[PDB]
Amino acid sequence: PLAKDLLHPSPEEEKRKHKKKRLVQSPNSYFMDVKCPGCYKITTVFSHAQTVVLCVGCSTVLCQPTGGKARLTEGCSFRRKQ
Amino acid sequence: GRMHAPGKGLSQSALPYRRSVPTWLKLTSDDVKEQIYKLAKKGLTPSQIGVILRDSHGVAQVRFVTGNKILRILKSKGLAPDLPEDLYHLIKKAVAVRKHLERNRKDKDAKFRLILIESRIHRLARYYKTKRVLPPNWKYESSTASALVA
Amino acid sequence: MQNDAGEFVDLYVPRKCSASNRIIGAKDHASIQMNVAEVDKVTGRFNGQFKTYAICGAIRRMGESDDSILRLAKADGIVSKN
Amino acid sequence: VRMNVLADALKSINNAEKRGKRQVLIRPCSKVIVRFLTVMMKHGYIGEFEIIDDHRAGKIVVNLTGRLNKCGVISPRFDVQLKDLEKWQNNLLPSRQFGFIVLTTSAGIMDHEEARRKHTGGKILGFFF
Amino acid sequence: SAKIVKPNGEKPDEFESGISQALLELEMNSDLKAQLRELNITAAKEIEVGGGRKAIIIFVPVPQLKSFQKIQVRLVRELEKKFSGKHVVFIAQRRILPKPTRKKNKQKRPRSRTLTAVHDAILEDLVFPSEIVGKRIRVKLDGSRLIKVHLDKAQQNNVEHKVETFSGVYKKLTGKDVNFEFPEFQ
After folding, report:
1. Rounded to whole angstroms, how far apart are CA atoms A28 and A19?
2. CB contact under 8 A, A1 and C20
C-alpha cells in the first residue's frame, strides 16, 4: 500500500476510524429529538447523555445514562436532527 | 501519558469543525446566560453546568453560543467560587483518603496514594498562585484542609 | 555527469525504479525490467511496440510490484479507467 | 511531551521515503515546518504539499518524490557564525556538490548557500540531502 | 443618495449616488422596518471578476453585521433585482492593527483584530448562507500557496455561480487566491 491517497479518503474508511486519528477530526455524537408518548414536547436530548433527563410536564423518565450511548426508557418516537 | 499511573489512554472529547450554532437551536445568548445564572445558584459548578444543558438543552458548547466560558460568565459578576473547581475536588478527595488512613494504619496502598494525591494538589496549587488566583500565602495544610471542603 | 566543461565523465547512467524512484544497482539481481505490449485500437492485436518499466529488487522483495505496475499502468492508459 | 515538532516532522518523512511511500502525514503543523518544507520543495526534493487547516494545530500531507536521501534535524538549535559555517558543512553534508544545511537567519529561513549570498549568520535548524 | 444609510468615519462620498438610495427605496420585504430605519452601511467597491461581470460589495459596521445575517438572502434578491447583472456581498470593516516590534502607551493588539483572524473572518460572511466545513491550503510547487475552501452542501442551492466572483472579491480585499469545492457529507 505505497499509494494510499491519504488526503482524500473514502467516507467508508473515514467512518470506521477513531474520532481522533481522522484526516479532520469530528465527533461520533449527535443531538436527537424525542417525542415522549403523550405530549407535544419534543425534547432535544443529547445522544451520549449522562444525566437522567426528565420531561417538563409529563414528568416521567425520558432516558437512562449508561456506558456509551444513552438507553432511552420507553420505546418512543425519535429522530436524528441537523 | 497519565501522570501518576502507567496509563496511555486515548479517550477525550472531540469538538467539531463548524463553530457556529446549528439552525435548530432557537435559543439566544441572553437566555442561555440567565439559565446558567439560575442553576449555578442551585449549588452547581461550571464542570456540571455545561453537562446538563448539553443533555437537556441542546447547547453543544456555551463558548460557541455566548462566545464565553462558563467559569468566565460566572466570574463576570462575582458568583464564581473561591477555590478553583479542580483544586476543590482534589482537596476533598485528599480529606477522604486521609480520614480512611487514620482508622487503617496497615493500609499501605492508601498511604502510597495519599502522597500522590497530595502532590497533585501542590503541583496545581503552585500554578494558581502564579496566575494570581490564589493568595501567595495560601498553603495546603492537611489539618485545616477539612474546613476548605464544606 | 556534466562537469564544468559540460562533458559526460561517467561510465554509465544507472536505471531507476519506476515505483520508488531509487537507483537499481549494478548487482541488484532481483530488479526486473519488463515489457507491456500495447495493442492498436480498432483490431486489438499486437502492433509492434511496447512500454518498459523497471522495478527495483528492494521494492520487488517487499511484495508490491503488482500494486506498482498496475499504478503505472493506471497513469499510462492501459488498465480500465475506473 | 513533544519537545521539538521539527524533529518529529522530519523523522516521519525520513521513515516513509525509505519505506517507499508516496505520501506522508505530518500531524502537528507550525510555520517553522512549512518554511522548512518550502526550502526543499524549491530545490526539488519534495513536491506539492497541502496544509490541512483545522481549528487546533493543522496537519500536512506531503507528496514524496523519491529524490530525498536523509532529511535530519540538529535538535539543539546551535548558533552558527559565518566563520563557523564552513566546518558545519563538511561535518554533516555528504559532499560539496549537493545538500543543504538550512538555518534560520534574521532575514528568514534560508540555505547555507543563500545565507552567504547575504551576510546573515544564524541558528542552525536542520539539514537535508 | 442621502446621508442616512451611508455614514463614514471620514468625509468622502464617491459612488453612492444610487447605492445607498437602492436600500432607501425598497418596500415590503421581510424585516422591512428594523432595516430601513436604524441600520447602516459604510462603503462600497465595484470590482471586476472574470470579464465584464462586476460585483458591488457592501462594507458593513461590525456590531450590526450580526443584524445583517438574518436578512441577507432577502436583501441580495432585491439588490440584484435592482442592480441586475451584478452580485451582492456583505463584508465588515474590520481594521487591521499592525504587529508591534522593536521600532505611546499602546495596550496590546487584540488577536480578534489581527491580520490572520481578520483575513479568515472575511471568508465566512462572504460565503454567508453556506458556511465552511473545511480548508485545504495547498502550495503550488513554486512557493505560491492556494486556499481550497470546502463549502457545506447543506446550503448549496443558493451558491453555484458565485464561486468565481467570491474568489475575485477575496483576491482584491486580501491578496491571496482561492477556489471552492462542494464535498459530500460526512
Report:
1. 6
2. no
Q: Please, which residues 1-20 of chain B have a Cβ atom closer than 8 Å to chain E?
A: 17-18, 20
Question: Is the residue at B85 inside a domain?
Answer: yes
What method was applied to determine this entry?
Answer: cryo-EM
Q: CA D108, E138, D7 angle in degrees (round to 5)?
A: 55
Which is nearest to D13 in space by CA: D57, D54, D50, D63? Answer: D63
**Closest partner CB to C59 (pick from D20, D65, D67):** D20
Four-way CATH pick for D1-68: 3.50.50.60, 3.30.450.40, 3.30.1370.30, 3.40.190.10: 3.30.1370.30
Q: What is the 3-state secondary structure (H, E, C) of E19-65?
A: HHHHHHHCCCCCCCHHHHCCCCCCCEECCEECCCEEEEEEEECHHHC
- Residue ranges and CATH numbers for the domains of chain A are 1-82 (2.20.25.100)
The answer to whether the Cβ–Cβ distance between A6 and D23 falls below 8 Å is: yes
Long-range pairs for C72-75: beta carbons < 8 A, 24 or more residues apart: C72/C18, C72/C19, C73/C36
Q: Is D118 on the interface with C (CB under 8 A)?
A: no
Contact between E79 and E89 under an 8 Å Cβ cutoff? The reply is: no
What is the DSSP annotation of chain E?
A: --TTT---SSS---S-TTHHHHHHH---SSS-HHHHTT-----EE--EETTTEEEEEEEE-GGGTHHHHTTSHHHHHHHHHHSTT-EEEEEE-----PPP----------GGGSHHHHHHHHHHHHT-SS-EEEE--EE-SSS-EEEEEEE-SSSGGG-SSTHHHHHHHHHHHTS--EEEE-PPP-
Sheet holding D123-128, edge to edge: D108-110, D100-105, D123-128
Burial class (CB in 10 A: 0-12, 13-18, 19+), D126: buried
Resolution in A: 3.1
State the Rg of chain C over Cα.
16
CB C53, CB C16: distance < 8 Å: no
Q: At D61, which helix (H) or strand (E)?
A: strand D59-64
Three cell numbers, residue A45: 436530548
- Nearest-angstrom CA–CA distance, D39 and B88: 51
For B138, residues 6+ apart whose C-beta sits below 8 A from its C-beta are B125, B129
